Design a protein around this ligand. Structure first.
Ligand code: HEC
Ligand code: HEM
Ligand code: HEM
Ligand code: HEM
Ligand code: HEM
Ligand code: FES
Lengths: 379, 82, 111, 49, 49, 64, 49, 241, 379
């Protein structure tokens, strides 16, 4: 405080959304993931840009350039692993951002929630092409099965797969296209994320109680900047723990052998954040059904706001729905466990039952849960 | 963004008191009442959080047990003999 | 959810389960009545605007102190909880009229 | 009737030195703010590294 | 579609905007066909055969 | 943090003016970083005594 | 290559003439020609450094 | 056979969160590579200059590099010519192309040993158990020519003659070259050849724990101090009459 | 339901700057280059992304990949040339955007003008970095002479020259870094350009008259959108004329031979839009003076708003300054002409005189021109 501050027609007023923005006081710790997601996004761009200064997309010198990054570049080994393990932190933070909206009814912000699904699709697409960049027998084959799923579409399935592949199979043509696409997509995410906030600042946050918090708003700057800074450190501590103590804990060991189209890995599987999607697709013998269920499960988020039934909004005072919510989270963990395991007789039964429960809970049990409690509250 | 302090809502007949952050301890009664609080909080949610994840471990402890049993050979050497 | 008060109970009577669910919901522990936690749509928001000043001002403080309780992740003492029998719908009469008004308005544009 | 208002008891959260109502608060003002800024100075030192 | 409820006022509204919605799908059909020369469709036009 | 205490002189001497507050942050970073590296590295050698190159380097280069 | 006047070396872009040791005879060159470190271990091999 | 066996978790000098590699074992581990592995196994990502400051001195590694002749591109007449290697040269490739490698052996292609520790499930534990796990095939198993039984190998039939035996080589420092000892050194080397950053990985890890173990309580204090205003805040409702 | 009150609580309110924005009626054609510049960005990014799907940054396969783009990729030859000639159209449009501000006193918009210089610097950095991508004996050697200029900086020259180079000279290490840097910078330009407009819409636009046009503002949508569309076509016609009828008219023929560090080109020179700056640096025999004059001439734009003297804003009613403005434009053309010529005795004399006149006009003659007319108009 020094003057009347004069001026004002500049970009500072746009920054009032970071300083003077009203915010609920009772915002819990499940909310730093909003700022953590922004921290993760600019972290991938920062490390990714320096990775792109030594990475070459040609198949003859793609894998060998990744080795040159770690072996030769000064401090180039850490940058590769905060990039590889940051995407693990990105999807760790991404799934709690979705989970909080499910629990606290944040999907009632229809504009923000719908843009959120678009943001989810963009990152999952971006992280898919990044895995193909190292070209390491998991990049080639992980991209082989997933992209070949598009062949189940009729009258365009074969045409667009080759159009996606740039040829008859995954090869140098596909690899160069992915690196260029992997470079641009994150900058699209920044623009959408700004649009994501633009649809939220009109209505503010969503206190865990679920009631309007207009009576108890507090300034953002002195209270939540220091709360997000602490949350950022817990992210850096968690990310750096993987990088400096178990860099390959999450990544598959088979990715360290150069891609060989003539040789198939013992077990072919995507990264851990797509494993739950793999389980749903593998649960149906049909090919067209599997790809649709793979897309429907991801795209079911847009259908959630149309399934609200409870007269309340947050699950704080909905004990019946709380039991179902953690059943869905547990089932989503069962899908992750199933995806990393080979298709044999103990897992086909478990995989089909978990997948049929994943859709049954959200489509039937959860809307019926809200209706039941409405009778129990005389409204 | 068309919304700021001044027009948020109409609040009447409510008095609040607060202290300077320098005149109060940052960590007051941390373990004196915080620890008994967390026990209260955990009980209020352990009946809605634990059972869904307890079942998953039961699936884990059985889905993996059956998988090794499948890989294990079974004594079906009869009908061939010597 | 937890064991029902009687012995274990599958579904006994109707008031017993509603009373059991009220304590399970836990909005009484924050000193909130049932209609202090409702979702504010374009209908409820208008029905709030018709509340009397004494009733509306009471609702503001009940919400204001509940957010203070939620901020500290605390609850009111055992004696300050909202009794289930003493809970009364101060918003149902106002909601019903807005229900009546909206249904008449919608059906007038249909006929 | 506004004189009926009385600031509640904050002694539960009050720092030990400002606990006494008789003793002036200016004696420890330098050190009360000194300890709080020491945390900030030590945090920035760690972040600077 | 193009309505809100199921009533005579909306039924008249839907019927009144059917011819425009009738020919609007032609742009979606012909325009998509024009974009990628849909053969099965381009095989019936006499001048473009 | 009471009458004649270390922090009272610490605040008045340095933290009273924000200009000198930044000085102790940058000067403190100089002395902290030098001591922290030596302090944290010396633990690493103790954990790995007779393991790294410097612990067996003396066996070569005409020193043995 | 050896197509010069006062040392055999000429810069064809802008013009710079160097003697045997690289001394600048003409051209807007501020510093003389580079000379690497000299050391020897064998009479038949050299290392530029 | 087509069955899997879980490798045992052998204790290592570098199994801890802060434990580092034993560089004495790395020096002995390379001696296994330059005498046994290099005969038919390639390592095309590690150079002779990488061993400087890890297991050999600069003069030691230069002598090792010059011990092997390599190609030095086109001559003045546009022809190939041999020359003693340098520090910058990578480890020699036993065969020019994988087709030659499959011809040298019974079709099996020896995998590159640069990442074989990190490119196999179990890490060095599996490799150590694979090298020392050779045993007579059980009754009821018939192996074709050029195939040997190794339970730790997936499939239990591996195209590998036992590469390590007692006193197969001689160590410079004089440690006995026993069957188990030689396998331990090469496994220690094969980890360094796969993760040269291993020592610095933990060195920065310890610094992080001390750094973050101090900042986390401090940053929490700033959060509590700024939020102590709202935590200690009393509400009073005093409506009229 | 108010048609005017449209879907406002969305991103359209921002789009009101494109439809309902008040604009002066007397806007001439010289203003069209603002919208053309945005089209040049979008065109460069669109063609750039598809170029990046076949370009490989490794030195051994950089030039050969550019040949593969033209020779093998379907319709890949045109995309390479709309990129090569789009930069020519970019700097054609960029220099008239600056010239209009000089003539019409648009630099009085201090915030917008200063961001404009930042925008100018970013593009010349992007254009210079992208020229090195083909790696064709003009890329290697054009970057060699310009980057080596930083070695003249005292006590830090060689330290940052190598840090730019990633080594002791331009090589594969520099080539990979440039391609990654060339990918990121254009997306920065979009963000700055949005900020560039944000500092202008608050203060409106300028008119050739130079007086306030608040009395005669017109809606943007029906009058300037169709005026910019016509201006866009004239840009597409001009750009396509080069691409389809003289693709290598502006580019130097020597760039088609692969880069050879052992061999120097017959004549070394940058692209035509940097030739005006090459002459200024070559004017001074001193090395430190030349690099400073190269930077000062580009950075003199920020010093222009502090040199205003006339009581009139635009040069419309300033005949004395008009004679000087076209003298500066002619001199800037003389610098461009002499930039591409070898340093011999006729161009040494003309080069110094043109350079000394370039600074003399703006620093001395133009401010003195405004003072003379101010006295001539009784004020
Ligand atoms: C007789 C030549 C030869 C020798 C000597 C040799 N290898 Fe190999 N190595 C092979 C061949 C052939 C294979 C492939 C076997 C197969 O795929 O069935 C192989 C495979 C391997 C594998 C891969 C095992 C797997 O499951 O993928 C490892 C690890 C390995 N060797 C390590 C070593 C080590 C360590 C040494 C030195 C003690 C060594 N080898 C010496 C020829 C050799
Ligand atoms: C939201 C943004 C991003 C996500 C989620 C993401 C994700 C990933 C993932 C999962 C990998 C696989 C690494 C591995 O498994 O070893 C990868 C690799 C890679 N990414 Fe990204 N990335 C992002 C942004 C970027 C950007 C902006 C760039 C460049 C400017 C980039 C460049 C690279 C490169 C070069 C690789 C290969 C090198 C390596 O794998 O270490 N990434 N990315
Ligand atoms: C890179 C990806 C994303 C970024 C950077 C991002 C960013 C943010 C931020 C910073 C907030 C406000 C912080 C907060 O209120 O806690 C927010 C709010 C929100 N986001 Fe996202 N988000 C991303 C992806 C998603 C996804 C995957 C969803 C899935 C539903 C989503 C839906 C929402 C919702 C519903 C809110 C409402 C918050 C509230 O209730 O107050 N977003 N987003
Ligand atoms: C304002 C933006 C840009 C400008 C002014 C610019 C300028 C240039 C120039 C002058 C060249 C030299 C071409 C030649 O002389 O043959 C070039 C090449 C190239 N640019 Fe850009 N560029 C821009 C944006 C981009 C973007 C966004 C990408 C990729 C996403 C890109 C990718 C390339 C590639 C791959 C080349 C080499 C291929 C070729 O030269 O034909 N450029 N650029
Ligand atoms: C990619 C680069 C650039 C883009 C996309 C851009 C975009 C624009 C646009 C669209 C306008 C409004 C159009 C108009 O009023 O005619 C504008 C205004 C302006 N720009 Fe830029 N610009 C760029 C670079 C520059 C440069 C190099 C300068 C150098 C001085 C500059 C300075 C200005 C000024 C002075 C105005 C004032 C317009 C007026 O007075 O009405 N900008 N810019
Ligand atoms: S003559 Fe070419 S740089 Fe000097």
């Amino acid at each position: 405080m020094t003057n009347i501050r004069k001026s004002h027609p500049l970009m500072k007023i746009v920054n009032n959304a970071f300083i003077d923005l009203p915010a609920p006081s009772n915002i819990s710790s499940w909310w730093n993931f909003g700022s953590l997601l922004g921290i993760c996004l600019i972290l991938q761009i920062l490390t990714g840009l320096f990775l792109a200064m030594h990475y070459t997309s040609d198949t003859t010198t793609a894998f060998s350039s990744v080795t040159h990054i770690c072996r030769d570049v000064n401090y180039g080994w850490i940058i590769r692993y905060m990039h590889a393990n940051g995407a693990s932190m990105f999807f760790i933070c991404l799934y709690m951002h979705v989970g909080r909206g499910l629990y606290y009814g944040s999907y009632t912000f229809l504009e923000t929630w719908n843009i959120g699904v678009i943001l989810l699709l963009t990152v999952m697409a971006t992280a898919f092409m990044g895995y193909v960049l190292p070209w390491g027998q998991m990049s080639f084959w992980g991209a082989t099965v997933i992209t070949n799923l598009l062949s189940a579409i009729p009258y365009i399935g074969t045409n667009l797969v080759e159009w996606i592949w740039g040829g008859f199979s995954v090869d140098k043509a596909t690899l160069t296209r992915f690196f260029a696409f992997h470079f641009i997509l994150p900058f699209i995410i920044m623009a959408i994320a700004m649009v994501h906030l633009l649809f939220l600042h009109e209505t503010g946050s969503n206190n865990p109680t679920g009631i309007s918090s207009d009576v108890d708003k507090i300034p953002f700057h002195p209270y939540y900047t220091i709360k997000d800074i602490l949350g950022a450190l817990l992210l850096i501590l968690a990310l750096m723990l993987l990088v400096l103590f178990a860099p390959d804990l999450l990544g598959d060991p088979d990715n360290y052998t150069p891609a060989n189209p003539l040789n198939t890995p013992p077990h072919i599987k995507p990264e851990w954040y797509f494993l739950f999607a793999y389980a749903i697709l593998r649960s149906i013998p049909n090919k067209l059904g599997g790809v649709l269920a793979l897309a429907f499960s991801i795209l079911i988020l847009a259908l959630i706001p149309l399934l609200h039934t409870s007269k309340q909004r947050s699950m704080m005072f909905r004990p019946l729905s709380q039991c179902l919510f953690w059943a869905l989270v547990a089932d989503l963990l069962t899908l992750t466990w199933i995806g990393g395991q080979p298709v044999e007789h103990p897992y086909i039964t478990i995989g089909q039952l978990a997948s049929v429960l994943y859709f049954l809970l959200i489509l039937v049990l959860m809307p019926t849960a809200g209706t039941i409690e409405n009778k129990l509250l005389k409204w | 963004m068309g919304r700021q302090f001044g027009h948020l809502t109409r609040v009447r007949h409510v008095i609040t008191y607060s202290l300077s952050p320098f005149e109060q301890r940052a960590f007051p009664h941390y373990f004196s009442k915080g620890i008994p609080n967390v026990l209260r909080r955990t009980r209020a949610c352990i009946l809605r959080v634990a059972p869904p994840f307890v079942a998953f471990y039961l699936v884990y402890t059985w889905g993996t047990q059956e998988f090794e049993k499948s890989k294990r050979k079974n004594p079906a050497a009869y009908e061939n003999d010597r | 959810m937890a064991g029902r008060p009687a012995v274990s109970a599958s579904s006994r009577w109707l008031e017993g389960i509603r009373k059991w669910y009220y304590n399970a919901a836990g909005f009484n522990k924050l000193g909130l009545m049932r209609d202090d936690t409702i979702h504010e749509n374009d209908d409820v928001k208008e029905a709030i605007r018709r509340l009397p000043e004494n009733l509306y001002d009471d609702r503001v403080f009940r919400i204001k102190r509940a957010l203070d309780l939620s901020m500290r992740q605390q609850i009111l003492p055992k004696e300050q909880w909202t009794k289930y029998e003493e809970d009364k719908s101060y918003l149902e009469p106002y909601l019903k009229e807005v229900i009546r008004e909206r249904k008449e308005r919608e059906e007038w544009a249909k006929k | 009737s506004h004189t009926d208002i009385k600031v509640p008891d904050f002694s539960d959260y009050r720092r030990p030195e400002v606990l006494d109502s008789t003793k002036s608060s200016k004696e420890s003002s330098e050190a009360r703010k000194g300890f709080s800024y020491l945390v900030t100075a030590t945090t920035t030192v760690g972040v600077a590294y | 579609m193009l309505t809100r409820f199921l009533g005579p006022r909306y039924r008249q509204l839907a019927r009144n905007w059917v011819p425009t919605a009738s020919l609007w799908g032609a742009v979606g059909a012909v325009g998509l066909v024009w974009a990628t020369d849909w053969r099965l469709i381009l095989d019936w036009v006499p001048y473009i055969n | 943090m009471v009458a004649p205490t270390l922090t009272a002189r610490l605040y008045s001497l340095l933290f009273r003016r924000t200009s000198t507050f930044a000085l102790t942050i940058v000067v403190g970073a100089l002395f902290f970083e030098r001591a922290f590296d030596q302090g944290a590295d010396a633990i690493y050698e103790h954990i790995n005594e007779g393991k790294l190159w410097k612990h067996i380097k003396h066996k070569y280069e005409n020193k043995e | 290559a050896n197509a010069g006047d006062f040392g055999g070396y000429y810069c064809p872009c802008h013009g710079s003439h160097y003697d045997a040791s690289g001394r600048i005879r003409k051209g807007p060159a501020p510093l003389n020609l580079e000379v690497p470190s000299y050391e020897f271990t064998s009479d038949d091999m050299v290392i530029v450094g | 056979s087509d069955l899997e066996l879980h490798p045992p978790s052998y204790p290592w000098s570098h199994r801890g969160l802060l434990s580092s590699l034993d560089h004495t074992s790395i020096r002995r581990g390379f001696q296994v590579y330059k005498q046994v592995c290099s005969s038919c196994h390639s390592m095309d990502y590690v150079a002779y200059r990488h061993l400087v400051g890890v297991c050999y001195t600069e003069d030691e590694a230069k002598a090792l590099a010059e011990e092997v002749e390599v190609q030095d591109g086109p001559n003045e007449d546009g022809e190939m010519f041999m020359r003693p290697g340098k520090l910058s040269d990578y480890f020699p490739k036993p065969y020019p192309n994988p087709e030659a490698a499959r011809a040298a052996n019974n079709g099996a292609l020896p995998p590159d040993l640069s990442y074989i520790v990190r490119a196999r499930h179990g890490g060095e534990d599996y490799v150590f158990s694979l090298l020392t796990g050779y045993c007579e095939p059980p009754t009821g198993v018939s192996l074709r020519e050029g195939l040997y039984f190794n339970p730790y190998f997936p499939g239990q039939a591996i195209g590998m003659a036992p590469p390590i035996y007692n006193e197969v080589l001689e160590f410079d420092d004089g440690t006995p070259a026993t069957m188990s000892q030689v396998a331990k050194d090469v496994c220690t080397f094969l980890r360094w050849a796969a993760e040269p950053e291993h020592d610095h990985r933990k060195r920065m890890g310890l610094k992080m724990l001390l750094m973050m173990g101090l900042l986390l309580p401090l940053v929490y204090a700033m959060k509590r101090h700024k939020w102590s205003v709202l935590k200690s805040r009393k509400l009073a409702y005093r409506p009229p009459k």
